[PDB]
Design a protein around this motif. Structure first.
Motif, PDB file in Angstrom:
ATOM      1  N   UNK A 127       0.864  -1.251  -0.086  1.00  0.00           N
ATOM      2  CA  UNK A 127       0.155  -0.021   0.052  1.00  0.00           C
ATOM      3  C   UNK A 127       0.907   1.236  -0.015  1.00  0.00           C
ATOM      4  N   UNK A 128       0.442   2.422  -0.396  1.00  0.00           N
ATOM      5  CA  UNK A 128       0.908   3.772  -0.138  1.00  0.00           C
ATOM      6  C   UNK A 128       0.253   4.438   0.839  1.00  0.00           C
ATOM      7  N   UNK A 129       1.376   5.300   1.620  1.00  0.00           N
ATOM      8  CA  UNK A 129       1.035   6.460   2.334  1.00  0.00           C
ATOM      9  C   UNK A 129       1.138   7.660   1.538  1.00  0.00           C
ATOM     10  N   UNK A 130       0.158   8.620   1.207  1.00  0.00           N
ATOM     11  CA  UNK A 130       0.436   9.989   0.679  1.00  0.00           C
ATOM     12  C   UNK A 130       0.441  11.308   1.664  1.00  0.00           C
ATOM     13  N   UNK A 131       1.458  12.106   1.356  1.00  0.00           N
ATOM     14  CA  UNK A 131       1.511  13.183   2.147  1.00  0.00           C
ATOM     15  C   UNK A 131       1.331  14.384   1.257  1.00  0.00           C
ATOM     16  N   UNK A 132      -0.010  15.098   1.584  1.00  0.00           N
ATOM     17  CA  UNK A 132      -0.411  16.122   1.073  1.00  0.00           C
ATOM     18  C   UNK A 132      -0.934  15.895  -0.388  1.00  0.00           C
ATOM     19  N   UNK A 133      -2.300  16.681  -0.519  1.00  0.00           N
ATOM     20  CA  UNK A 133      -2.761  16.661  -1.868  1.00  0.00           C
ATOM     21  C   UNK A 133      -1.875  17.521  -2.936  1.00  0.00           C
ATOM     22  N   UNK A 134      -2.213  17.598  -4.178  1.00  0.00           N
ATOM     23  CA  UNK A 134      -1.645  18.022  -5.038  1.00  0.00           C
ATOM     24  C   UNK A 134      -2.248  19.589  -5.591  1.00  0.00           C
ATOM     25  N   UNK A 135      -2.918  20.357  -4.554  1.00  0.00           N
ATOM     26  CA  UNK A 135      -3.312  21.345  -4.397  1.00  0.00           C
ATOM     27  C   UNK A 135      -4.497  21.650  -5.349  1.00  0.00           C
ATOM     28  N   UNK A 136      -5.587  21.241  -5.100  1.00  0.00           N
ATOM     29  CA  UNK A 136      -6.803  21.081  -5.662  1.00  0.00           C
ATOM     30  C   UNK A 136      -7.513  19.878  -6.237  1.00  0.00           C
ATOM     31  N   UNK A 137      -8.733  19.865  -6.310  1.00  0.00           N
ATOM     32  CA  UNK A 137      -9.527  18.512  -6.949  1.00  0.00           C
ATOM     33  C   UNK A 137      -8.873  18.116  -8.218  1.00  0.00           C
ATOM     34  N   UNK A 138      -8.716  18.893  -9.303  1.00  0.00           N
ATOM     35  CA  UNK A 138      -8.300  18.420 -10.472  1.00  0.00           C
ATOM     36  C   UNK A 138      -7.067  17.793 -10.366  1.00  0.00           C
ATOM     37  N   UNK A 139      -6.036  18.674  -9.766  1.00  0.00           N
ATOM     38  CA  UNK A 139      -4.458  18.145  -9.784  1.00  0.00           C
ATOM     39  C   UNK A 139      -4.500  16.799  -8.989  1.00  0.00           C
ATOM     40  N   UNK A 140      -5.504  16.873  -7.931  1.00  0.00           N
ATOM     41  CA  UNK A 140      -5.260  15.566  -6.968  1.00  0.00           C
ATOM     42  C   UNK A 140      -6.006  14.176  -7.631  1.00  0.00           C
ATOM     43  N   UNK A 141      -6.795  14.596  -8.421  1.00  0.00           N
ATOM     44  CA  UNK A 141      -7.518  13.344  -9.391  1.00  0.00           C
ATOM     45  C   UNK A 141      -6.398  12.781 -10.393  1.00  0.00           C
ATOM     46  N   UNK A 142      -5.533  13.819 -10.914  1.00  0.00           N
ATOM     47  CA  UNK A 142      -4.434  13.587 -11.717  1.00  0.00           C
ATOM     48  C   UNK A 142      -3.192  12.797 -10.922  1.00  0.00           C
ATOM     49  N   UNK A 143      -3.106  13.216  -9.791  1.00  0.00           N
ATOM     50  CA  UNK A 143      -2.118  12.555  -8.797  1.00  0.00           C
ATOM     51  C   UNK A 143      -2.509  11.256  -8.729  1.00  0.00           C
ATOM     52  N   UNK A 144      -3.691  10.929  -8.370  1.00  0.00           N
ATOM     53  CA  UNK A 144      -4.087   9.373  -8.200  1.00  0.00           C
ATOM     54  C   UNK A 144      -4.056   8.497  -9.494  1.00  0.00           C
ATOM     55  N   UNK A 145      -4.250   9.156 -10.616  1.00  0.00           N
ATOM     56  CA  UNK A 145      -4.075   8.490 -11.952  1.00  0.00           C
ATOM     57  C   UNK A 145      -2.585   8.300 -12.141  1.00  0.00           C
TER      58      UNK A 145
END
Ligand SMILES: [Zn+2]
Ligand SMILES: [Zn+2]
Ligand SMILES: [Zn+2]
Length: 232
Positions: free
Chosen positions: A48-66
């Motif tokens: 599994x992965x531990x994430x520290x911090x979002x990617x600064x907004x919903x659009x970027x964060x969806x791109x981060x997960x992808x």
């Protein structure tokens, strides 16, 4: 090697592998008409992965997960936000909808609520006093005291000697203070000294925005904060 604004398309995210099971994530965002890069961290723990911090907004964060699914292919199960600003929590709702358990200190959750920013679900206990440290899987979380914000946390990855300073630590390219509206300028150098005393073995230091360095980023940040304090 390290990604910059020029390399990141709008609403996209890049990953940078630091060590076995350790990456930073890099996104960009516009604020007052200027474009800023912004970093977070990803740490493997078993499958599994531990994430520290979002990617600064919903659009970027969806791109981060992808991008994590494309480049790593392991699920993010927990996330920690290191202070209440939108570059750290904006995107928490995207994480929650994806089944990630989102965490922050009670201070960060309260401040995010006051501000109208997204609020991580879970609370991190044991971090309310300056100098407090707690384990969180493959990392240690540390509250150094007030600095960039009153609630700012730092994250250490002991297996890789990676210190993630978040927005309490400036990159070398930043030679004047950034957003200090929520800062404790008077305490910021003392808080940095607590980081140095707790993690003197750190080899790779990641600022909240911009290029990684070594423990010299702590001295750099103190220099910049003191110069701002002495503005006249
Ligand atoms: Zn901030
Ligand atoms: Zn939960
Ligand atoms: Zn920031």
């Amino acid at each position: 090697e390290y990604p910059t604004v020029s390399e990141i398309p709008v609403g996209e995210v890049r990953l940078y592998q630091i060590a076995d099971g350790v990456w930073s994530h890099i996104a960009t965002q516009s604020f007052d008409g200027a474009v800023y890069p912004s970093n977070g961290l990803i740490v493997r723990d078993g499958d599994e992965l531990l994430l520290i911090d979002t990617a600064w907004g919903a659009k970027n964060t969806a791109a981060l997960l992808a991008e994590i699914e494309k480049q790593i292919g392991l699920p993010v199960t927990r996330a920690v936000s290191t202070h209440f600003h939108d570059d750290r929590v904006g995107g928490v709702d995207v994480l929650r909808a994806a089944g990630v358990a989102t965490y922050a200190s009670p201070s960060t959750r309260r401040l995010a609520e006051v501000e109208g920013n997204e609020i991580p679900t879970h609370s991190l206990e044991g971090l309310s006093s300056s100098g407090d440290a707690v384990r969180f899987g493959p990392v240690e979380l540390f509250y150094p005291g007030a600095a960039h914000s009153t609630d700012n946390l730092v994250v250490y990855v002991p297996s890789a000697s990676v210190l993630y300073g978040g927005c309490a630590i400036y990159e070398l390219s930043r030679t004047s203070a950034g957003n200090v509206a929520d800062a404790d300028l008077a305490e910021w150098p003392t808080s940095i000294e607590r980081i140095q005393q707790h993690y003197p073995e750190a080899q790779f230091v990641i600022p909240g925005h911009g290029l990684p360095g070594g423990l010299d980023l702590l001295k750099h940040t103190t220099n910049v904060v003191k110069a701002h304090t002495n503005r006249s």
